[PDB]
Amino acid sequence: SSSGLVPRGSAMGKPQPIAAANWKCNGGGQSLSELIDLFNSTSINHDVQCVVAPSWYMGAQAMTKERLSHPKFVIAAQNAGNADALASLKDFGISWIVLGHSERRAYYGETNEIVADKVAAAVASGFMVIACIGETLQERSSGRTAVVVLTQITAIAKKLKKADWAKVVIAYEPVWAIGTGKVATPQQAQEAHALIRSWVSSKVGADVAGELRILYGGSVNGKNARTLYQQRDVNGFLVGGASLKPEFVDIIKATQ
Amino acid sequence: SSSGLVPRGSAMGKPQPIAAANWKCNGGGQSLSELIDLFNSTSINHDVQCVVAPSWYMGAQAMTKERLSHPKFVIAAQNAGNADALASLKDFGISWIVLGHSERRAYYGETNEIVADKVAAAVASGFMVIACIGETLQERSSGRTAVVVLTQITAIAKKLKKADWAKVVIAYEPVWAIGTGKVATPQQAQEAHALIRSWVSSKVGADVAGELRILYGGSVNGKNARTLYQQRDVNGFLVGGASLKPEFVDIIKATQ
Numbered sequence: 385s386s387s388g389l390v391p392r393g394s395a396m397g398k399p400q401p402i403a404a405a406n407w408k409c410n411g412g413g414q415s416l417s418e419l420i421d422l423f424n425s426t427s428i429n430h431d432v433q434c435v436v437a438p439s440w441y442m443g444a445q446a447m448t449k450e451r452l453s454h455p456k457f458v459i460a461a462q463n464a465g466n467a468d469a470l471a472s473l474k475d476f477g478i479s480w481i482v483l484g485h486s487e488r489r490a491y492y493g494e495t496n497e498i499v500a501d502k503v504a505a506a507v508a509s510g511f512m513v514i515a516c517i518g519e520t521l522q523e524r525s526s527g528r529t530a531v532v533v534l535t536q537i538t539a540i541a542k543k544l545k546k547a548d549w550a551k552v553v554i555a556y557e558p559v560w561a562i563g564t565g566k567v568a569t570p571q572q573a574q575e576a577h578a579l580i581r582s583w584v585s586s587k588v589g590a591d592v593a594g595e596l597r598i599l600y601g602g603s604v605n606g607k608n609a610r611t612l613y614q615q616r617d618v619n620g621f622l623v624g625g626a627s628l629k630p631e632f633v634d635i636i637k638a639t640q
Numbered sequence: 641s642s643s644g645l646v647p648r649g650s651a652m653g654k655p656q657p658i659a660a661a662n663w664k665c666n667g668g669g670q671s672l673s674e675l676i677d678l679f680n681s682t683s684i685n686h687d688v689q690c691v692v693a694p695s696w697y698m699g700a701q702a703m704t705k706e707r708l709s710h711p712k713f714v715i716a717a718q719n720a721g722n723a724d725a726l727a728s729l730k731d732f733g734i735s736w737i738v739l740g741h742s743e744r745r746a747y748y749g750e751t752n753e754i755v756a757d758k759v760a761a762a763v764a765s766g767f768m769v770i771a772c773i774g775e776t777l778q779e780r781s782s783g784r785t786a787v788v789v790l791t792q793i794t795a796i797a798k799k800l801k802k803a804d805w806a807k808v809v810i811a812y813e814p815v816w817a818i819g820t821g822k823v824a825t826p827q828q829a830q831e832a833h834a835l836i837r838s839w840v841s842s843k844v845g846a847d848v849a850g851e852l853r854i855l856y857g858g859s860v861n862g863k864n865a866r867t868l869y870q871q872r873d874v875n876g877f878l879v880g881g882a883s884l885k886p887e888f889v890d891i892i893k894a895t896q
């Protein structure tokens with residue numbers, strides 16, 4: 385009861401996009417300062433939630449908490465943590481967390497149970513959690529992706545009640561795309577994201593599933609972001625390498 | 641009752657050196673493979689325990705567990721973890737862990753209590769733990785080092801019984817030396833290490849204190865390692881950047 389005079393122009397839809405930067409690996413306290421100068425000097429007119437994930441390493445989070453002021457940016461913790469670690473995070477007004485592969489993989493092989501526990505402990509303390517799931521290249525080559533991907537989100541979901549999903553973001557980031565220059569095709573991304581959503585729709589709720597954001601991560605850059613975002617089931621990006629460059633702004637723009 | 645015919649030639653002494661490589665930041669599954677080819681092809685004749693800490697990231701730990709065979713090398717986990725994470729580590733025959741700054745600092749400011757808990761949980765599952773302590777540049781400039789350093793190890797110690805120290809290694813790595821090219825002078829290192837040992841001697845036992853290894857970490861490379869190791873209270877090195885280069889071999893040799 386709220387369309388125009390004429391059909392369409394689209395079947396979506398689409399929750400609000402996120403564009404997340406993970407600065408886990410950078411030792412340039414200076415250029416980072418400059419980056420967030422760029423970010424601040426940057427007019428983002430559409431509805432997108434931008435996230436920056438600094439390390440303690442070098443300037444990093446201290447610099448960011450101080451010098452980043454843009455209204456569409458929040459700061460997230462990387463991993464985290466103990467119950468003390470969460471209590472500490474609250475104290476410093478950090479309310480987002482990125483969880484995923486380190487956690488699943490740090491301890492020599494698929495500890496999804498740890499991912500699930502961490503996501504839930506976090507949601508339980510009121511955090512927004514970006515949860516990452518993805519196959520390895522081996523699992524991809526052997527056509528195990530669908531099984532692996534579902535296994536991972538089933539784990540995360542087991543520890544959550546329907547209402548927790550309000551605070552959950554999913555990042556689909558295949559391990560073979562991380563730092564490798566091998567990004568998923570828009571068709572791959574769409575496929576996996578669609579799979580994930582169909583799972584959430586069925587097992588949690590269609591209500592929840594349409595509101596859920598599933599970000600794509602893995603070798604996203606200025607070039608490939610738009611075509612990727614075009615996909616029906618992509619709601620933004622988890623970005624590592626290119627997040628440390630002025631092109632992150634372009635990754636953000638692609639999210640419109 | 642076991643000297644030669646003639647005094648000296650030294651007042652030490654000195655427990656067995658460690659030379660630890662932390663590969664937290666490297667995306668070159670190929671060159672790493674080559675590195676450990678170099679490490680394997682490398683004859684280390686003296687008593688030194690070499691440690692390599694791979695990430696899950698890229699090839700990394702999978703590659704290392706497979707391809708590293710040298711008898712004087714063990715593999716350590718980076719951080720870790722949950723009780724599941726430790727249980728997982730045991731399963732894969734990983735028996736060493738590096739804990740420190742991420743842990744103390746990940747959650748926006750000095751969570752030493754987390755470091756202590758983690759070190760003890762680890763020692764309790766039978767792990768060798770390399771525990772890192774260090775001031776920030778601010779704390780250094782303002783002459784707060786002694787207070788900060790002691791605060792940190794006092795925390796670690798609180799959760800340990802005298803016999804746990806058998807499994808504890810201390811890494812003194814000032815945060816201002818990490819990835820910054822600003823390494824401690826041999827005199828700084830000696831000072832801090834000496835402080836730490838005097839603390840352990842007094843509060844834990846002189847017995848324990850002389851057997852304890854305190855490694856120096858922070859911008860160690862082929863050039864500076866020897867002069868550093870020469871110091872009475874330095875028992876080796878925690879090495880990040882230069883550990884990813886053929887010069888790590890030289891850092892190892894310096895430990896003789």
Ligand SMILES: Cc1ncc(C[n+]2csc(CCOP(=O)(O)O)c2C)c(N)n1
Pocket residue numbers: 406408462463482483484485486487516557561562563564565601602603604622623624625626
């Ligand atoms: C707790 C935790 N720590 C780290 C990670 C890994 N990680 C998070 S951001 C990013 C995306 C960009 O890579 P690229 O350089 O290709 O843009 C990667 C692959 C995780 N999933 N969970």
Ligand SMILES: Cc1ncc(C[n+]2csc(CCOP(=O)(O)O)c2C)c(N)n1
Pocket residue numbers: 662664718719738739740741742743772813817818819820821857858859860878879880881882
């Ligand atoms: C759990 C945990 N994760 C990470 C760290 C940091 N970190 C460990 S190895 C290394 C030494 C070489 O730096 P450089 O590049 O100067 O040789 C640094 C500074 C810690 N203390 N605890």
